[PDB]
Design a binder for this molecule. Structure first.
Ligand SMILES: [Mg+2]
Ligand SMILES: [Mg+2]
Ligand SMILES: [Mg+2]
Ligand SMILES: [Mg+2]
Ligand SMILES: [Mg+2]
Ligand SMILES: [Mg+2]
Ligand SMILES: [Mg+2]
Ligand SMILES: [Mg+2]
Ligand SMILES: [Mg+2]
Ligand SMILES: [Mg+2]
Lengths: 215, 45, 117, 321, 392
RNA sequence: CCCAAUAUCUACAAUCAACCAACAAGUUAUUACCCUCACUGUCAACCCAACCAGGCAUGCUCAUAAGGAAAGGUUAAAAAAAGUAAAAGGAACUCGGCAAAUCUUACCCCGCCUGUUUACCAAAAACAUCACCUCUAGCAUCACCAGUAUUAGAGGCACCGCCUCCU
RNA sequence: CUAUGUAGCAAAAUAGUGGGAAGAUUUAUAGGUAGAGGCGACAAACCUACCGAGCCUGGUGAUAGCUGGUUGUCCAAGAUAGA
RNA sequence: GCUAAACCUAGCCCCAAACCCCCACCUUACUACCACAACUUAGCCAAACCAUUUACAUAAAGUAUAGGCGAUAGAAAUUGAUGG
């Protein structure tokens, strides 16, 4: 099967791009994961997760101000378009982010813990013990892979020489270098649990279909 | 009711039985060669 | 479901009906928006001579002598083309007698053929 | 229904369009404006410089159509003093003109309908470059029963043999706006020929008495379409023939050469039954084509003529008395 | 997280045949027989260069080696660009203060009734309709065709006011207007290349609208600053441009002095239509560009405070909402962030008509909102023709 | 039947698009080019069903301006098929009010509902389905996914509330 | 659901009566999944009229303790323990 | 009396000998004209199932040998080689 995956874009831009659904079909052509297909057409907004990325030929902590916090089909959380310097980025927003707010993004580990606003991005070591974080990264300068879903809080547990132990939402710990950049707060779209979809048609709209088999 | 399984279409007919589709795989070249040997004057659809 | 009859431009859907030519040469190229540009150079300009005063006709009288078939061969052409000049100049280094060593700087190349009948 | 094209390459299409229209054609006739006209001519040709270089295939779309737009807009803007009609007028840029009529019958020559008699429908669609519509009808040129010695030429051959092709789409009568528009009557139309039909393309062709054919064909077809649509907007049609002559004017230009036409529709009864004996004819009253100027060298316009501009303003000065 | 999955990039070239890395050997490759063969070595051919270069397959040299290439990054504002913060961003870029509401002088040029066009109210109403209900063969015309006619025939409606004064037939409407104005701001070399239409010019340039004692009364005002957004967001940062101002034409023109700029966001789909704020910002920048081009033509490229301020107008519209701007330039001196500023009076969100119904609205055959415009406000037209009349 | 190259961009729906209300979230600046209309479809009573009361997307006419012919001639037997009418009685027929004529009511079992299924004997009390529960999984560039525990996959059950003698 | 039809107009139709008909709907167009595999709102349902495992060619003249057959004239001997 | 019934060769089978032969066309083949690659026979079938197993010059010799030592498989040394 001539299946060139759609995820072929290289340059970054805030404009939505044209998703092509898969239906569970992998590159060969066979149902690899049952229960996928159909549903509303969607476009993809390239949300950028390295929340500490300085613009071209600049450095040092930077401030950005939001513009809007809109629905996103692909995520479960609500993305936000942050403007800074001469650059716009899509970033996952936390619960209490309104249009017009401002957020700091720093890699500067202070002498001691700096009381951080509930949307800013700081290195793990820079935060105090007992706060809530999102968009954690496994290792520095990599990107956010851990907590990103809707309404998920990640507690910071402790710090030791060069590392920090954080608690993931699944009720278990993990170690990460203290220079890993996280965001303090709770991911947006809280109480997304309580979405009684009501009827099978909604499931079909989202993209799921009922599949018997799954040998 | 059955019997009308052939809904003709030139694009499909030329795509799934044509000269280039045969020549795009060893099995197809074998098919063309069999039909060259048997004498056919309709090698490819 | 017919595979014996020839395949020509009258057969497929719109796309096929358009793409397939009918043996006709091209004279130009498609530009943007399906606009066609013609090139005066790719259109064969016929070269017809002046037939006035010509003393030959489509046929030849039945009162003509016969002869033998003697096809022109490279030797026969060379014999009366350049040889006499050689012999005349043999009584006292080849391009002077019509030899053309290379065929890039002439309009009608002999091999490959860059001209037309 | 046949698709009649006002701007047509077909040879001698003028007389064919006469037959389809029951129109006779008569050869003859029924201040710093020169400064502003030449200034618009220059500001579209040489003065105003484009960013992307001019190519000679859209030259009749970006250096000759704005020329007519400016000419008509300025003349209408400054001539409102001398004619209050233009003031509360309706100026339309590239608005569509459609007419749909029936003339003749033919016996279907093949199929499961052979022998059976069917009407010979026509359809004219036209994008006039500029047009001026008014709210009070103009004054007819000659009365409604102007018998003339000239007779409509007869085409014995089928319509197709002059390149003319059938099709089937919506049928549309349209003067430039729907029925509700008060400015339903019509005053003037300015047409710009595409480059296909221009002088130079037919100069590679080696005939002279065919250049005016395209002008005449464009005039006849487009003015008949417009006038007929005006008529049928008032309730008239073939079986209720118009009582008052309808009239309109057209200026047809290729960008350098101009011609003028004064058409007067008398009859819509063109069906075979309603044209049984109706001796009304439509009339055209066109002129030849003259050159507005000679050339545009650097900044002047050598040989700029004032007769053509005078005729244009003349046609714009008409009043609905 | 890099962008671009591996399986979509060109390819890793196939591993080379080892015969090449034997120092004395010249391999046997299939270049002798002009066609691929899978049991020889893949050749290595010279990079092919066309002695000619056909136009249909030309490949431009990269942006670096163009003759007009400048190291410093210009910030152009051409038609499609859309300022993020909008009005105040344009103010900063132009060093001006937004004075809400049109100036009293022009708004007092229409209060007198003698500047009335015949049957004004009903004629503007039927012009609205003619543009929006009777224009084409379909029941509901679209914006791409009814945005331009509203303006292009409202100006014609007002243009019939020559009878009162024969000095009105002294101006023309032009299309295809391309004016380029380059200036500087805090070592940011900005340019504005306005390629639009619906501009009208005049022989006699417009008068100053603010007193010489009011242009100086702006120094006290502190030009607004936004943070952390740069003043160049959404501007086209280009290394290909020119330090050269052109008004869009050349020497010796009747009607050379611009009067008003009409801007037409006529795209059918909303996302291709500039928001209100973006539209006002576009108006401000285009007007300032025209004014600066005129100033450069009159005086030259010298940063200074103008003795004779040049004013321009602009109306931006989509078809039912109108924005009016009067912009008075008084300084070519712009590098500094203090001094004499230019003035900009703007009226926004001015509705010519609240809504339009093209087909009758029926609940139970009790038609409630019949065909036509609902919520017409002639005051928008009052201000429109006011801006038109000023400068007579 | 198409398009010269490179960079830039390309945040806000569509619904008469304006009011309310939502969710399923819907090209240009530079460089190169002053060339013109060639080539093909164009017919018919037609195609897929071996020749055919079957199958066949869209636009427009909504009963026709277009298109057609249910009876080879006769007589008016039975049995058969379709239809119309019917005295009094009105389910006594029958496995059952199937068919037909008339239009109302009440309950009980099963399944929550709309939907899907055995192309060609079963459309259901089966499958699916919102809701709930259980099990597994700490995470890169070809599916799940350009996703990250309120997520993804695999299972059971089936919203919600209440519990683990007459005829 | 009933009646007609059962080599029928049709290798599943016709006439009436019916369920849905802004949605988990219906549908034209090109592409994909290939046979112990695909697909499946699981019915062993469907994958070109016949699928508890497509179709074609080859091994293949498969094998068959089973069924059916086995061709001129005339004569003569010729039958029911058991392992 | 119809229907029919009759015919010869067109060719072919097996040997011997000799080693055999203008244009368009891989895109939708038969279309004048633009930026990846190729390199162990399983099993029907016998063993009356089936599971190891089961065949692809003459002579020596169906011998040595192999084999649920069953069914079956099986050498070598040496010997000498135009016609119907
Ligand atoms: Mg036709
Ligand atoms: Mg009829
Ligand atoms: Mg009959
Ligand atoms: Mg009969
Ligand atoms: Mg009865
Ligand atoms: Mg149901
Ligand atoms: Mg046997
Ligand atoms: Mg037995
Ligand atoms: Mg005996
Ligand atoms: Mg056996």
């Amino acid at each position: 099967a001539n299946f060139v995956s759609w995820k072929s874009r290289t340059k970054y831009t805030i404009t939505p791009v044209k998703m092509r659904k898969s239906g569970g079909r992998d590159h060969t052509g066979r149902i690899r994961v049952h229960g996928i297909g159909g549903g509303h057409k969607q476009r993809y907004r390239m949300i950028d997760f390295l929340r500490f990325r300085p613009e071209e030929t600049k450095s040092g902590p930077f401030e950005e101000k939001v513009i809007q916090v809109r629905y996103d089909p692909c995520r479960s959380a609500d993305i936000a378009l942050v403007a800074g310097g001469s650059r716009k980025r899509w970033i996952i927003a936390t619960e209490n982010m309104q249009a017009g707010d401002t957020i700091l993004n720093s890699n500067h580990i202070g002498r001691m813990a700096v009381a951080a606003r509930e949307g800013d991005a700081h290195p793990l070591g820079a935060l105090p013990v007992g706060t809530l974080i999102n968009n954690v990264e496994s290792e520095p300068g990599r990107g956010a892979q851990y907590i990103r879903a809707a309404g998920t809080c990640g507690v910071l547990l402790r710090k030791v020489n060069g590392t920090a132990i954080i608690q993931l939402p699944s009720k278990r710990q993990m170690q990460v270098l203290e220079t890993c950049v996280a965001t303090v707060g709770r991911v947006s779209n809280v109480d997304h649990n309580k979405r009684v979809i009501g009827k099978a048609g909604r499931n079909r709209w989202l993209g799921k279909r009922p599949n018997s088999g799954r040998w | 009711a059955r019997g009308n399984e052939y809904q003709p279409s030139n694009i499909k007919r030329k795509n799934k039985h044509g000269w280039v589709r045969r020549l795009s795989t060893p099995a197809g070249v074998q098919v063309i060669l069999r039909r060259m040997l048997k004498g056919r004057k309709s090698l490819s659809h | 479901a017919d595979r014996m009859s020839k395949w020509t431009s009258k057969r497929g859907p719109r796309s096929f009906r358009g793409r397939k030519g009918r043996g006709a040469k091209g004279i130009g190229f498609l530009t943007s928006g399906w606009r066609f540009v013609q090139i005066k150079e790719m259109v064969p300009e016929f070269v017809v001579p002046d037939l006035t005063g010509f003393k030959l006709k489509p046929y030849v009288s039945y009162l003509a002598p016969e002869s033998e078939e003697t096809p022109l061969t490279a030797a026969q052409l060379f014999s009366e083309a350049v040889a006499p000049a050689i012999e005349k100049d043999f009584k006292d280094n080849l391009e002077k007698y019509g030899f053309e060593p290379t065929q890039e700087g002439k309009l009608f190349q002999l091999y490959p053929r860059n001209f037309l009948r | 229904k046949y698709m009649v094209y006002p701007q047509t390459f077909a040879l001698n299409a003028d007389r064919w369009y006469q037959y389809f229209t029951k129109t006779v054609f008569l050869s003859g006739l029924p201040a710093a404006l020169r400064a502003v006209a030449c200034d618009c001519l220059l500001q579209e040709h040489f003065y105003l410089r484009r960013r992307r270089r001019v190519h000679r295939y859209e030259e009749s779309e970006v250096i000759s159509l704005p020329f007519l737009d400016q000419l008509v807009s300025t003349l209408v803007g400054l001539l409102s003093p001398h004619n209050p009609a233009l003031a509360a007028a309706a100026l339309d840029y590239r608005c569509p003109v459609h007419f749909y009529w029936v003339r003749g019958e033919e016996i279907i020559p093949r199929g499961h309908r052979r022998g059976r008699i069917d009407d010979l429908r026509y359809q004219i669609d036209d994008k006039p470059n500029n047009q001026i519509r008014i709210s009070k009808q103009l004054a007819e040129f000659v009365p409604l029963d102007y018998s003339v010695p000239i007779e409509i030429p007869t085409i014995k051959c089928k319509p197709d043999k002059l390149p003319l092709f059938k099709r089937q789409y919506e049928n549309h009568i349209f003067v430039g706006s729907k029925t509700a528009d008060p400015c339903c009557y019509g005053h003037t139309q300015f047409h710009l020929l595409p480059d296909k039909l221009r002088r130079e393309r037919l100069l590679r062709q080696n005939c002279a008495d065919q250049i005016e054919v395209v002008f005449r064909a464009n005039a006849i077809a487009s003015l008949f379409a417009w006038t007929g649509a005006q008529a049928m907007y008032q309730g008239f049609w073939s079986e209720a023939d118009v009582t008052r002559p309808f009239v309109s004017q057209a200026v047809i230009t290729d960008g350098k050469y101009f011609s003028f036409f004064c058409y007067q529709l008398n009859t819509l009864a063109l069906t075979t039954q309603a044209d049984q004996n109706n001796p009304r004819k439509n009339i055209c009253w066109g002129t030849q084509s003259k050159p507005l100027y000679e050339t545009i060298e650097d900044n002047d316009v050598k040989g700029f003529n004032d007769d053509v501009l005078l005729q244009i303003v003349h046609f714009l000065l008409n009043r609905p008395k | 997280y890099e962008w671009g999955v591996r399986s979509t990039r060109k390819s890793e070239p196939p591993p080379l045949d080892r015969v090449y890395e034997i120092p004395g050997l010249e391999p046997i490759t299939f270049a002798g027989k002009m066609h691929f063969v899978p049991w020889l070595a893949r050749p290595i051919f010279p990079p092919w260069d066309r002695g000619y270069k056909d136009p249909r397959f030309y490949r431009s040299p990269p942006l670096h080696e163009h003759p007009l290439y400048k190291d410093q990054a210009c910030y152009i504002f051409h038609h499609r660009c859309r300022l993020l913060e909008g009005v105040k961003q344009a103010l900063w870029l132009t060093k001006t203060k937004l004075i809400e509401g049109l100036p009293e002088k022009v708004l007092s040029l229409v209060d007198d009734p003698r500047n009335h066009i015949e049957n004004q109210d009903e004629c503007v109403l039927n012009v609205i309709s003619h543009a929006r209900l009777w224009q084409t063969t379909e029941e509901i015309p679209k914006r791409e065709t009814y945005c331009p006619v509203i303006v292009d025939n409202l100006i014609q409606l007002c243009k019939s006011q020559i009878l009162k004064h024969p000095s009105l037939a002294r101006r023309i409407c032009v299309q295809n207007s391309t004016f380029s104005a380059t200036w500087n701001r805090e070592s940011l070399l900005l340019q504005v290349r306005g390629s639009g239409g619906a501009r009208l010019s005049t022989k006699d340039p417009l008068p100053t609208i603010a007193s010489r004692e009011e242009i100086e009364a702006t120094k006290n005002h502190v030009l607004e600053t936004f943070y952390p957004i740069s003043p160049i967001i959404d501007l086209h940062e280009c290394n290909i441009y020119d330090v050269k101002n052109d008004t869009g034409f050349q020497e010796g023109y009747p009607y050379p002095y611009p009067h008003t700029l009409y801007l037409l966001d006529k795209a059918n789909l909303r996302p291709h239509r500039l928001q209100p704020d973006q539209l006002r910002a576009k108006m401000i920048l285009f007007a300032f560009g025209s004014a600066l081009a005129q100033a450069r033509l009159l005086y030259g490229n010298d940063a200074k405070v103008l003795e004779q301020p040049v004013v321009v107008q602009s109306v931006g519209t989509d078809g039912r909402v109108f924005h009016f701007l009067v912009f008075q330039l008084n300084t070519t001196d712009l590098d500094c962030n203090e001094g004499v500023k230019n003035l900009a009076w703007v009226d926004s969100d001015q509705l010519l008509y609240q809504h339009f119904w093209c087909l009758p609205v029926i609940k139970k055959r009790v038609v409630v909102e019949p065909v036509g415009p609902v919520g017409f406000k002639p005051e928008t037209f009052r201000k429109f023709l006011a801006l038109y009349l000023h400068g007579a």
